[PDB]
Amino acid sequence: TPEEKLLRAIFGEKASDVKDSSLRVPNGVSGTVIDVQVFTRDGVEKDKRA
Amino acid sequence: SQLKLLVTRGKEQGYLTYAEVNDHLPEDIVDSDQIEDIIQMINDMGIQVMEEAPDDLMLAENTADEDAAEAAAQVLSSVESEIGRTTDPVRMYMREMGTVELLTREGEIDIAKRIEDGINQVQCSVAEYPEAITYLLEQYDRVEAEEARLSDLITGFVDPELAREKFAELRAQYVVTRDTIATAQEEILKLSEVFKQFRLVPKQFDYLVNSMRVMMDRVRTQERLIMKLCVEQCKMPKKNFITLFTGNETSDTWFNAAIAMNKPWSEKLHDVSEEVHRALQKLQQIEEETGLTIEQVKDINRRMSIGEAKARRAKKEMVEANLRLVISIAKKYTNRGLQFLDLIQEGNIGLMKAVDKFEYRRGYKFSTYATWWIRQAITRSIADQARTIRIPVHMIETINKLNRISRQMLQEMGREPTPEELAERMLMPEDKIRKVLKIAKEPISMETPIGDDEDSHLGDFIEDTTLELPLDSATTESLRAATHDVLAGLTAREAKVLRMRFGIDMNTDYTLEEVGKQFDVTRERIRQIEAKALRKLRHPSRSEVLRSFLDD
Amino acid sequence: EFDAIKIALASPDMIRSWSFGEVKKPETINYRTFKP
Amino acid sequence: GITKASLATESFISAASFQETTRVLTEAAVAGKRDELRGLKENVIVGRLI
Amino acid sequence: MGHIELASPTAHIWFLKSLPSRIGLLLDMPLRDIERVLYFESYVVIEGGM
Amino acid sequence: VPLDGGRFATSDLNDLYRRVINRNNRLKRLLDLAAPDIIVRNEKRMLQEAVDALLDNGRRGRAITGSNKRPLKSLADMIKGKQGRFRQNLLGKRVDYSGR
Amino acid sequence: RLVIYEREAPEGTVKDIKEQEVYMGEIPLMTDNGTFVINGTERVIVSQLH
């Protein structure tokens, strides 16, 4: 927007090219993670947790 | 009429069952759609004809109660007096193709000869159009000069240099026919004879004949300008119009001698005299362009109309039996993406094309040459207008191939074929196979019922992802206020420079040069002012709320 | 704002005045790049 | 009756909300009716004050 | 909105199959007669004249 | 609207509108070729059916059905019916600033 | 097993004798406790009183 440019210039920020859509626990739920399972496609490379 | 008493019994019962609405129907109704229509008529005025007899649950009292009742009753009382389905567009087409006897056994060749002898009277009429011949001569001298490919004039003829020298001989005969303005009597005719041994490009011939029609229509437009402006506007007698104007049509002894005839119709033509005066000049000049008395070209084009009408009238009967054939073939392309009637209409268009492109000089079974065109047209249309998102034909072919190979592998491997293995079979990269797999699937219907007691649909659970969260709008307004405040707390020059540079509270922003020339300064000083302003705003104290808007 | 609702038949000229352009082809989207 | 008295309303926006919509719409259209919101159902559908 | 130029006229179904038959009432013609004329199974004279 | 996984979802009207354009276009094409009047009459009847299904599907002629085998909805069913815009006040209009 | 019953007599003598163990699909099996696993979720097929 025409103003956000001024603030960006002032503080010299760096707008990110990527926006986060991460799995976060539902509100009002508290508990202990007891199991994590990871399924990978046939082409993708398994990460260091799988 | 037991139908009336059926309606009364339904009123007295408060409902009708399917057995009741079957027992009291006319015993001569065979078509079901008439039964559907009459039950719909009954339901429109009441009472709903449910399929079973079904105490203490109140039913819809009399919702379908209105004057519409009696009128509806009349409709029912009129249904018995006559009969007819007319409720399935397929059935009417079937009946109409039944009417035309499917019996043209070697009469097809007779009608083909009729067409050949009907599309040649138009050729004869074209022959006496030296303007088209002049165009052909010009295009001969044009293509041989390599302004266009030589074959642009012929789709084959009845050798390059032989054709060029034959056209040169035509040029010689035409110059002798043209500079011999009672000596052009025989020459032109003879030149027409040798000219009748040619075969034009479809586009060339069609354009030339349409230009012939355009010229004759200009002549006929002048004929209107002389006719209705006088006969229908000035009340010039129809007999008088047939007498004087018709026969000369070019001289001044039929209009300028029409006002001077000293008749009640004559001396009233002064008011509309100007337009006829000008039409005489126009037609006299056009006769120079065409070099033919108006009546002659009128008659030749009338004969052309006769010939083309004869051709079309026989193509009708040619097309009908092959339409029966089209039904027969198209019966086996159902359930792909198109209703039956669209399939048969595409087939009929293809058949029209085939008949327009058939010759009776090859000893072919017409149930062979045409059926190919029919199937090709049907499959083309099915591939082009069967799905919401239009995937090109080659992708359709690849999808079909993939499905065939997948079925084969499943029957062979004994399980599902992995896309890696399927790409192993078909020499295609894995990514292409995955893409084509994704592409094919057709869209869902947003009115697909979901299993909820509220009886919702899949379209009611699709959130909108383009909206601006009402908190973002408030944040933007707060930012607009805060930037206004912070600008206020600066030197006037710095605030004005910043507003122009970044476009705050303004229309299109302006460049350094533009803002510099704005008040009065070079660009460098404007840059210095902007730098000073940004240095101040970067300084703390004045940089608390904005940094909060950052929230970093 | 407004103060009544009126309903009547729509003339061809009225319908042409509502519209912003004629819809000729039957094709919706481009199946590879989903622009209209 | 209470079921043949409600089918006499003079605001097709009201009458079209609980009766057969097609019939009410056609009858209103051919007759060129004007609906001047003076009921409670009408001003509810339109979003005004009852 | 958009508009489609129909090649040939077409009968607005609401004003035909409503069963007062608005077109029928206006023309003084039974519904079945206009049905025959529309579905191309007859001819209707618009000007007998002489 | 594009659903997840590359799969699309659409309302029935799209279908019907397509059904009314193809035929319409085809009709024009026939009139350009001066086709025999039997097929043009059949085409005109088809176009009439398409329009009558678009305005109100299933009113008279055995409503055309979609791939789902269900009878696809038309402009006269988005207004009418217990599930139309009208009668939405039967049970409708979720509301913000609320809880239970 | 496919047999073409060669077309002379008796009603075609048999000469072709094919014999292939073809695959006709999958039949879901019943867990030890009368429950089926259809898509990773246990299901129960209720009896019907017709």
UniProtKB/Swiss-Prot annotation, chain E:
**Organism source for this protein?**
Escherichia coli (strain K12)
What protein name applies here? DNA-directed RNA polymerase subunit beta'
- What are the coiled-coil residue ranges? none
Q: Which residues of the full protein are shown?
A: 102 to 151 of 1407
Could you tell me the superkingdom of the organism this chain comes from? Answer: Bacteria
Modifications after synthesis and translation: Acetylated on several lysine residues in the presence of glucose.
**What exactly does this protein do?**
DNA-dependent RNA polymerase (RNAP) catalyzes the transcription of DNA into RNA using the four ribonucleoside triphosphates as substrates. Resistance to the antibiotics salinamide A, salinamide B, rifampicin, streptolydigin, CBR703, myxopyronin, and lipiarmycin can result from mutations in this protein.
Q: How does it assemble?
A: The RNAP catalytic core consists of 2 alpha, 1 beta, 1 beta' and 1 omega subunit. When a sigma factor is associated with the core the holoenzyme is formed, which can initiate transcription. The rRNA transcription and antitermination complex (rrnTAC) consists of RNAP, NusA, NusB, NusE (rpsJ), NusG, SubB, ribosomal protein S4, DNA and precursor rRNA; S4 is more flexible than other subunits.
Which gene holds the coding sequence for this protein?
A: rpoC
Family (UniProt): Belongs to the RNA polymerase beta' chain family.
The protein's use is: Co-administration of salinamide and rifampicin or salinamide and myxopyronin suppresses the emergence of resistance to both antibiotics.
Curated annotation (Swiss-Prot), chain G:
Tell me the part of the parent protein that is shown: 101 to 150 of 1342
Gene this chain is encoded by = rpoB
What's the protein called, per UniProt? DNA-directed RNA polymerase subunit beta
Uses described in the biotechnology field: Co-administration of salinamide and rifampicin or salinamide and myxopyronin suppresses the emergence of resistance to both antibiotics.
Q: Summarize the protein's role.
A: DNA-dependent RNA polymerase (RNAP) catalyzes the transcription of DNA into RNA using the four ribonucleoside triphosphates as substrates. Resistance to the antibiotics salinamide A, salinamide B, rifampicin, streptolydigin, CBR703, myxopyronin, and lipiarmycin can result from mutations in this protein.
The protein's PTM annotation reads: Acetylated on several lysine residues in the presence of glucose.
Q: How does it assemble?
A: The RNAP catalytic core consists of 2 alpha, 1 beta, 1 beta' and 1 omega subunit. When a sigma factor is associated with the core the holoenzyme is formed, which can initiate transcription. The rRNA transcription and antitermination complex (rrnTAC) consists of RNAP, NusA, NusB, NusE (rpsJ), NusG, SubB, ribosomal protein S4, DNA and precursor rRNA; S4 is more flexible than other subunits. In pull-down experiments interacts with CedA. (Microbial infection) Interacts (via flap domain) with Escherichia phage lambda antitermination protein Q; this interaction renders bacterial RNAP resistant to transcription pausing and allows it to read through termination signals.
- The organism named in the record is Escherichia coli (strain K12)
Q: Which family does it belong to?
A: Belongs to the RNA polymerase beta chain family.
